[PDB]
């Protein structure tokens, strides 16, 4: 009679590796790197995201003509952007610190647009003349719908004075613009005065833009340019302008009202009527593992990422071929 | 390898033994059979558990990069949080490959380890009733069937 | 007769973790995480620290009114301000290149002030007019001390035409300003020009500072601003200022005498009376031990720090209930 | 674990024998006792103290993060200088964990190597003049009053 | 009659560590840090670097007198500088971002210089007068050779009005300057219009540059300062310039011939007529090793650095002494 | 000194063998000799030669930090940049200092192990034919000459 110690085998063909040697062949493993995704852009937790589609974050805050889409959005989850969006500036120009705009917009998860400057309350000047072939709508001439080309009146422009005080309890993105015009004719037909400047100032703000007259390469049509600016404008302080021409007015701004964690993401995704916990550029991940290789950045309850093919432990012994 | 036991003084493992990962098989006038060890067998699985939620576990949390926006003339900045974050995942990358390795090449050991263990549980629990034959198998010098086999197994052979 | 081997236990509580089990009880072990602290700011290396209190770096170097106390400091070891502190600008405004200044302050250790345009040499200006109720003394409108407010005198601003030399052998921070007006009426009022600049130039310096004229909110009562600049001036080079009005002009500077390792921290603590060799905002440290999980930015002798609860190490053996 | 002595073949530890780490217990007719083997204790003391001095010495040393003043249009770099730090804490903080796990689960095999090492020293040392018992203790075959015991330990019992 | 077994012995010399012991003599080892270099600078894969010498990126690029050696350089592997070139901007002054445009000729291996507006050319200003003793050429006045220092022709300096448009298929480096002076006698006398200014525009390029009259420190003799700025210009865009004067003008531009991986190396090492797979600041590496101490920045097939003395594995076993 | 082998009840190396890491020692009527154990020898070599060249590949590939020029008043970002290399390199030299020392304690041990096991080769398989001398010889009962010698290295001296 015998009896003998002894140890399991299966008919496992899964190799790992190990200091000493590799593909060593176990009878069982468990493998902790990820690399699945549904390979859509879905909510996050249950909710939307902001995903522009063919406008720039720049195209959609100013109100390029072609974004009308995006006209009152609401609450998001987190920004999506094509690598270049074909909707940006339509008239050609800057906009100065965007990056750190668009930085700031990353944490935010909801606007509300608010009226601060109506269209009809400029009696002095002309409010519905600045319009550009570079900035169409249906065949026809437009611009930026959340600002305002302003124009002499009756060959004069007198000096703006205008101001709005931040009575709301959230703070508010306000923006701005300068035109920069091709030659001094253009200046005299559209502000008459040739000198000209625009002041702006709030508890912290203190900015004189002067135009800058001059020929250079025609984009879309326009030897012109269109320079924006913005400031975040505190509960209780005021934000005060001042111009005797080439003065882009406001006349929405945007009031801060829900703040959370997202941040702007390029990719080339549509939206997949779907939803989901964890998110990258390729593709969203549901899963229970804790590592993957699919992208480098990502947003949401995301198993953390390495740039390697395959990673697995033994769980099991040697197998006996 | 480092305890002998896994592919060494036992040549092979037991495709028929299926209940467990260590174990027995014996033979008497009754018949042969296998058996798995339950204890044996329950003490690796909570060990490489174990092992494996705290690789899991104890990743709270690596880097989480979320992106940046840099414009035409701050590459060098732009080199600069490129280059960060090369550093970093690949300093993640050569973490988790050798982890990998170096916790395969024990969890091996491991295993060999018991097996081992497992030998000199029942060697000794036998004492002198039994001739080792060197390959991992004790033979009786007295008989033993089914009630004296599992009574090996529940450690209460010879009990005093 | 019998002798056997074995190996000892004791009474010991202590357990540790290890990769295939938790809570293993051991007959000692070794704490390596330290996570004490005196909770106090002291003198590093038995020299006291610049605690700036309720003044700002900014309010310290141009001579906010409040700031008194340290008109002339000793040599110091490292600096100390509050998170908010409230003495900064007294009259509104802002200083350029702030954080690039604090950041050098980080890596000096003392400072001596010499004057070096003295305040009574304005022979054809006024000096002494230049006070604002937005930086009170004693209930009395005052200005900061290190920089000087000029004024017209007898309705005539005349071009002002001024150099210092560093004959010294140390660099020297040199600090000067200008002043933005909240309309022309003030300009005039101020300093007779209207359009008025202000030129400054070293071996590397060359600026024209322009003020900038405009209505904004009033903080501490003033829709003007001050806008503050500095540079280092090299051994053998001079600066030479000009300007027809809104020069907020030196007259002290700073010598930089001791250089050394330190930087800037913000802490709520007062001083300790105390001597130590580490320090955190929180507390300084006082141990042998090699690593800790108190505050991440830190100076001195300091034992690495980590974010975890507990590290500690098996010495001993299992220990048998 | 690994190495089957401690809590294995020998099933628990001395209260008793408070001088050293490893050692012996001896009873014969003058008496019985505890007492400690002076090198194989100091040869462990010497390793663990060696052990926990290299992770301590070797980090010469970790990341040094001084502070830095970033303004609200700077918030982009801020964020790097931000996420930099979160990394780099964050790698030593696995490091630091994994590292004490590993080493603390090496040191109590090296302790239970120990025990079986000086186990097989006064195997080998005795021959055939005693029997193992399979718990840790040789019974004498002759008397071993304490000089002889004492020589055991000494390791100049039967010198040859 | 005896069988035993046993290990190698033999008499190395070679100790290593381990965790729980130091300096443990074994009969083998593995040396895998590297710490040797050849110590002098070689052609990346067998074609030369760009070594500088004693000119700057800037004074090579300007065109300063000194660094006539690369008037028409060929392509290169890498571009070496030392740590304070004596040829930089002879005539005082600043080059705006210059560290990004040394950036971004970190990863070009080719100019090719094209003439873009002939200095002939300039019908209505003198353009052969522009020199200065702070520019010497063999004991002779001279200035940076690739662009133009205009001066006024018969008392007047009409405004000018030009451009290029870059025809070619690849991307053109473009530098021009503005010219700062020390007083209005010295801006009549060079441009004779009190109040002049320089405007650039590509597509994206909107500026206009106003010089600066002021006294400062005298550097080579100058008080006034010469300020260069550069732009990229597009394949099918264009250059506008307009200036009344302060204009230094561009004559060569730079087409990017050949782009690829290199980097701006401080080092104070010639040529060595030799050539090499690896290098550093101090030397270049031929080995086979897998790690080094060298020195920490690095171009090349490279084996990884780190900061330490002695890396090396046991491979054998314990020597018996 | 895990495993008890070398420098344990195997007191010393041999010079006289240079062939091979572990091997043979014989003595007979025809004489004495050294002799190494091919296959113990060869297996440790590739498991040594694939542990370096582990350490060694999976470096794909660390940190490549390329410099970055930042100027007079961007000392921030300057200083930023320095840290970030202080923090990454100072993290490899901790990885690559503490992996070489607890391998160079593996590979020792893997080699006492190594040794062990070559001794247990042999126990088994002369079984009850010699003597354990614990001092790593057996002493034979019966004639061994250069055939029988040869055949215990073979692994067929009594293939059954
Ligand atoms: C415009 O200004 C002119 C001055 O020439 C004035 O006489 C005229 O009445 C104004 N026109 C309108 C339409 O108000
Ligand atoms: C440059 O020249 C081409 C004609 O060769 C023209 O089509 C193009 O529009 C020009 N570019 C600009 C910006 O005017
Ligand atoms: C001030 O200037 C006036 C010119 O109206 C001159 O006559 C007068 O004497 C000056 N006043 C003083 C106090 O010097
Ligand atoms: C804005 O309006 C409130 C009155 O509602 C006033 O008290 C506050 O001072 C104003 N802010 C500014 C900057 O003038
Ligand atoms: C320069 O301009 C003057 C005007 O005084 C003109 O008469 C003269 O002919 C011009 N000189 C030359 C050399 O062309
Ligand atoms: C400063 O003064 C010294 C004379 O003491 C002089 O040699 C030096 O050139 C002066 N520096 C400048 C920039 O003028
Ligand atoms: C493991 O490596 C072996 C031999 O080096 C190679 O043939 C194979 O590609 C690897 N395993 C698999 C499944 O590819
Ligand atoms: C194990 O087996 C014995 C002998 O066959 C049997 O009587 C008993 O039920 C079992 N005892 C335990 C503790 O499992
Ligand atoms: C260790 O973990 C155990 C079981 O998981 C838990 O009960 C306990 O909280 C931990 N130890 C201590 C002292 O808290
Ligand atoms: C150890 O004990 C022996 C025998 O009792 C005693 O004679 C001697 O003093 C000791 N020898 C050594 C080397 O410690
Ligand atoms: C190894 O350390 C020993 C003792 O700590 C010391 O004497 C020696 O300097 C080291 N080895 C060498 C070769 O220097
Ligand atoms: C090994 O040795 C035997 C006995 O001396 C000899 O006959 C044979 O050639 C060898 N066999 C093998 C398999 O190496």
Known sequence: ?321 | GLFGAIAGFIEGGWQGMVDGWYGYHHSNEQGSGYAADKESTQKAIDGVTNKVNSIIDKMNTQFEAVGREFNNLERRIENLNKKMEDGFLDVWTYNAELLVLMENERTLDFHDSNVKNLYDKVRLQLRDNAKELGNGCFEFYHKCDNECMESVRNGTYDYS
């Open chain 1, 1 to 321: 009679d015998q009896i003998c110690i002894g140890y399991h085998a299966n008919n496992s063909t899964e190799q790992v590796d190990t200091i000493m040697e590799k593909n060593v062949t176990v009878t069982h493993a468990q493998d902790i790197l990820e690399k699945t995704h549904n390979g859509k852009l879905c909510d996050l937790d249950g909710v939307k995201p902001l995903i522009l589609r063919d406008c720039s974050v720049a195209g959609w805050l100013l109100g390029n003509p072609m974004c009308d889409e995006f006209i009152n959005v609401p609450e998001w989850s987190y920004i999506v952007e094509k690598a270049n969006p074909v909707n940006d500036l339509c008239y050609p120009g800057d906009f100065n610190d965007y990056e750190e705009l668009k930085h700031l917009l990353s944490r935010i998860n909801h606007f509300e647009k608010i009226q601060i400057i109506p269209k009809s309350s400029w009696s002095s000047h002309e409010a519905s003349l600045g319009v550009s072939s570079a900035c169409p709508y249906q065949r026809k001439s437009s611009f930026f719908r959340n600002v305002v080309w302003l124009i002499k009146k009756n060959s004069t422009y007198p000096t703006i004075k205008r101001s709005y005080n931040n009575t709301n309890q959230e703070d508010l993105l306000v923006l701005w613009g300068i035109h920069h015009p091709k030659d001094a004719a253009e200046q005299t037909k559209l502000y008459q005065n040739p000198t000209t400047y625009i002041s702006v100032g709030t508890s912290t703000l203190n900015q004189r833009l002067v135009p800058r007259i001059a020929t250079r390469s025609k984009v879309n049509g326009q030897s012109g340019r269109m320079e924006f600016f913005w400031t975040i404008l505190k509960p209780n302080d005021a934000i005060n302008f001042e111009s005797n021409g080439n003065f882009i007015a406001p006349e929405y701004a945007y009031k801060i009202v829900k703040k959370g964690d997202s941040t702007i993401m390029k990719s080339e995704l549509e939206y997949g009527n779907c939803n989901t916990k964890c998110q990258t550029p390729m593709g969203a991940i549901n899963s229970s593992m804790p590592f993957h290789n699919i992208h480098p950045l990502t947003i949401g309850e995301c198993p953390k990422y390495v740039k390697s093919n395959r990673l697995v432990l033994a769980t099991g012994l040697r197998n006996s071929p």
